[PDB]
Structures are given as structure tokens and as C-alpha cells.
Design a protein around this ligand. Structure first.
Ligand code: HEM
Ligand code: 2OH
Length: 395
């Protein structure tokens, strides 16, 4: 046909973006391409233009196609309180309500909880010795357990929360509301909400229950949608970064050795891991709602746009020598958490989880190493979030 060329996806090097991106970004940071669905849309690859799209409040997240799926069909989505598919003014109002209780202060307060969760999972790995799959024993279970503490889940209920979260982790966030595992999570959340109403606590769900609700928006469905969305948005993504960050650090002993010599670099290292790895691999989707202009290219009403966060995090106009992994950079504002109104709401919590996971993993296991070469690893090449399927490690 006369379709624009396929958006680059192949990687000859598994810790770098797809090979084709650089040449496009440099010549044409706003261009057309054809995505997995067969549809064509704008492909924005340069840092500055990705930020211009994402900060413009007239783009909508209600898109006509699902470009990264085979059939392109946009499935049915959850309602108010789920955020990801809402637009203003409802998105603005619902996010501000959730953010009233889901505060950066509540996220910092979870530090000790996180440290305990991280330490228990490593004592079990330790008690039974190498080799082990880090993905299954550590990267998958830790982030949902963090969230279960966020939600006040008591210890007798954890095994069931973890099993259900794990089934959901295998499903894409876009498909949750129309999959079976979604129903099983719905039933758990309905029940969790009733328990908290009956027995309030210090946790997030208890606080939302009694938050100041002038417009009368908070009912059980809103709460289930918010909790559900927090869990699903936090679990797969943070698990992928744990597994993929671990693999990259294990494959860069020079950067690892810097961190072991000066552990106060943990902050900076986490920022460079996020930039370098930008796990949302295929690009975020928006649709224009009015005519506009990005990078001197006219964008029309109804046109879909894909902001390629990975490509933009490797743009040489953003940082010097982008293909170099260097944990001593001064953090610059990467796009691994997005930008603008829909930017990751859990950014601060995810940073804490990763700082604690990598601080502690390398402090307790300085001899950690791969039990198989990086070319035998199997990467998540076709998944929404990039990472490793398995990460066998020893010490
Ligand atoms: C505690 C963990 C996390 C929680 C609770 C969380 C929560 C969320 C939620 C609710 C949203 C939707 C926000 C909205 O539309 O208003 C979101 C967006 C996003 N999150 Fe997270 N997140 C977590 C961790 C992560 C991690 C580890 C990453 C990436 C490495 C990530 C990347 C994103 C990105 C890119 C977006 C924006 C998508 C877009 O605008 O199209 N998040 N996050
Ligand atoms: C599990 C969840 C409550 C849900 C919502 C609606 C639904 O029909 C089925 C399941 C859900 C899914 C996805 C999400 O982003 C928020 C909440």
C-alpha cells in the first residue's frame, strides 16, 4: 500500500532502543508510521516534541485505535476513579481527590514497610541458596506486596491478594476490565472496601473512604476503580524494572562497582536506570481534539499520536552521550513516568521501591551474578512493558 513505514521495533542490542529509532529521531522527530494494528499514526520521537504533546491539555487519552494490538480494537474500560482513560474535567477532579490521600508523604511513610517486604523476600532466597529465578522469587511478588500494605491488607489475607495480583499481572491493563482475572480482582476489591468501611485503619482505602467529598463522587465503584488501577499500574511495571535493572547492572560491573564503592549514588542510579531502560516500549497513545502543531508539523483534529518515551530518553538533545549508562549523571527529567496531566501518580513510590530494592540487593549480595549469559536471557520483546521473562542468578 502507500502506508508509512512500520515503526521501528527490532533491537540488535537488548538494553538499547530499537536500531531504527535514532535515524528517524534525528531526521524527523515527528513523522508517520504504521503500528502493530496496521493503522498509521503520528510517531513522535524527539524529547522536546514528546514533551510538547504531553503537556498540551487538548490531547485526549480516549483514542480511536489500539495501535499496539493485532486487531486495533479499543476494549471497554473502567469508569470514574480509574484515571488512565479519563479526560478533563472529570480526570482532573478524580485525580485531585485520589491525590488528597495518596500523597507523597504517605509514600515516603511506606519506606520501613518496603524495607521489611524486601528483606523477607531476600531471607527466603538466601535460606535456600543459588541459583534462583529473581523474577519469580522477588521481582513479581514485592511490588504487589507493597501495594497490599498500602491498602492495609492484613497478614492472614496476603496469600490471596498476592495470587490474584499475580493473575492480573499477566493481563494487560487495557484488557483488565474485560478479562476473567479482572472479575476475580473486582470481587476481592469489593470485599476489601467493605472490610475498611467496617474497620477503618491508617491505610489509603480507609482515608479515601472518609476524605472530603464536596461533589459526592466517592462510592464503592469509585474506590474499586481507584484501587484496582493503583495495583495494576504499579505491579507489572515495577516488577519489570526490578528484573531489567538487575540484569543491566549485572551486565555493567563498572557501574555496579561505582555503586558498591559509594552507596549514596542509589538515588542517581535509580534515575539513570529509569531513563536508560524506559520500559513502556512501544509508545504512549493520544488523539488530537483540535487542530495543532508539533515541531512545525500540522496535526489535525482526530489524528492519533504515539509519543515514544524510550526514543525521547535517548535523544542527544536531552542528555550528552545517551547510549552510555552512567549512574553518576546529575538526574535530568526523563520521561519514564510520562509528563503532563496523566504523568505517573505513583512516581515517588516507585522510586522508593527501586532505591530500596537495589540498595538492599547489592548490599546483601555483593557476589551476585548471572547463572547464564545475557544472550541466553529471554527478553519481553512483544509485551507492553519490556523486561526479562526470567533472570537466573547466583552468588
Ligand atoms: C507504585 C507504583 C506505581 C503506581 C501506584 C503507579 C500508578 C500510576 C497510575 C494510576 C497512572 C495513571 C495516571 C493518570 O492517568 O492520571 C500511571 C501512569 C504512568 N505510570 Fe505509573 N505507577 C507506578 C509505577 C510505575 C513505574 C515503575 C513506571 C515506569 C517505570 C510507571 C510509568 C507510568 C507511565 C509512563 C505513566 C503514564 C502513561 C501515559 O500518560 O500514557 N509507573 N501510574
Ligand atoms: C479490576 C477493575 C476494578 C475492574 C473494573 C471494571 C470491570 O468491569 C472489571 C474489573 C479495574 C480494572 C482496571 C483498572 O484500571 C481499574 C480497575
Amino acid at each position: 500500500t502507500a502506508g508509512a513505514p512500520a515503526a521501528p521495533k527490532a533491537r540488535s542490542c537488548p538494553f538499547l532502543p530499537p536500531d531504527g529509532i535514532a535515524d528517524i529521531r534525528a531526521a524527523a522527530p515527528v513523522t508517520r508510521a504504521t503500528f502493530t494494528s496496521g493503522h498509521e499514526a503520528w510517531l513522535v520521537t524527539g524529547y522536546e516534541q514528546v514533551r510538547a504533546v504531553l503537556r498540551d491539555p487538548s490531547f485526549s487519552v480516549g483514542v480511536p485505535h489500539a495501535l499496539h494490538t493485532q486487531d486495533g480494537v479499543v476494549t471497554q474500560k473502567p469508569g470514574r476513579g480509574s484515571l488512565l482513560w479519563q479526560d478533563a474535567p472529570e480526570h482532573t477532579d478524580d485525580r485531585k481527590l485520589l491525590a488528597k490521600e495518596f500523597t507523597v508523604r504517605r509514600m515516603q511513610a511506606l519506606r520501613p514497610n518496603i524495607q521489611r517486604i524486601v528483606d523477607e523476600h531476600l531471607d527466603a532466597i538466601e535460606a535456600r541458596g543459588g541459583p534462583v529465578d529473581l523474577v519469580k522469587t522477588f521481582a513479581n511478588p514485592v511490588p504487589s506486596m507493597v501495594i497490599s500494605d498500602l491498602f492495609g491488607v492484613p497478614a492472614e489475607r496476603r496469600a490471596e491478594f498476592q495470587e490474584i495480583a499475580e493473575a492480573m499481572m499477566r493481563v494487560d491493563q487495557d484488557a483488565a476490565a474485560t478479562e476473567a482475572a479482572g472479575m476475580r480482582l473486582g470481587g476481592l476489591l469489593y470485599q476489601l472496601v467493605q472490610e475498611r468501611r467496617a474497620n477503618p485503619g491508617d491505610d489509603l482505602i480507609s482515608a479515601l473512604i472518609t476524605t472530603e467529598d464536596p461533589d459526592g463522587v466517592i462510592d464503592d465503584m469509585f474506590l474499586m476503580n481507584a484501587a484496582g488501577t493503583l495495583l495494576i499500574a504499579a505491579h507489572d511495571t515495577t516488577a519489570c524494572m526490578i528484573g531489567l535493572g538487575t540484569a543491566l547492572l549485572l551486565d555493567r560491573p563498572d557501574q555496579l562497582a561505582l555503586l558498591q564503592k559509594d552507596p549514596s549514588l542509589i538515588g542517581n542510579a535509580v534515575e539513570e536506570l529509569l531513563r536508560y531502560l524506559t520500559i513502556g516500549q512501544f509508545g504512549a497513545e493520544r488523539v488530537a481534539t483540535q487542530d495543532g502543531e508539533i515541531g512545525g508539523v500540522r496535526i489535525a483534529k482526530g489524528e492519533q499520536v504515539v509519543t515514544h518515551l524510550l526514543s525521547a530518553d535517548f535523544d542527544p538533545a536531552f542528555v550528552e552521550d545517551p547510549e552510555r549508562f552512567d549512574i553518576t549523571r546529575r538526574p535530568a527529567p526523563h520521561l519514564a513516568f510520562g509528563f503532563g496531566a496523566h504523568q505517573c501518580i505513583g512516581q515517588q513510590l516507585a522510586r522508593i521501591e527501586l532505591q530500596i530494592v537495589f540498595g538492599t540487593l547489592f548490599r546483601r549480595f555483593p557476589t551476585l551474578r548471572l547463572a547464564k549469559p545475557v544472550e541466553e536471557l529471554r527478553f519481553r520483546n512483544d509485551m507492553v512493558f519490556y523486561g526479562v521473562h526470567e533472570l537466573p542468578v547466583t552468588w
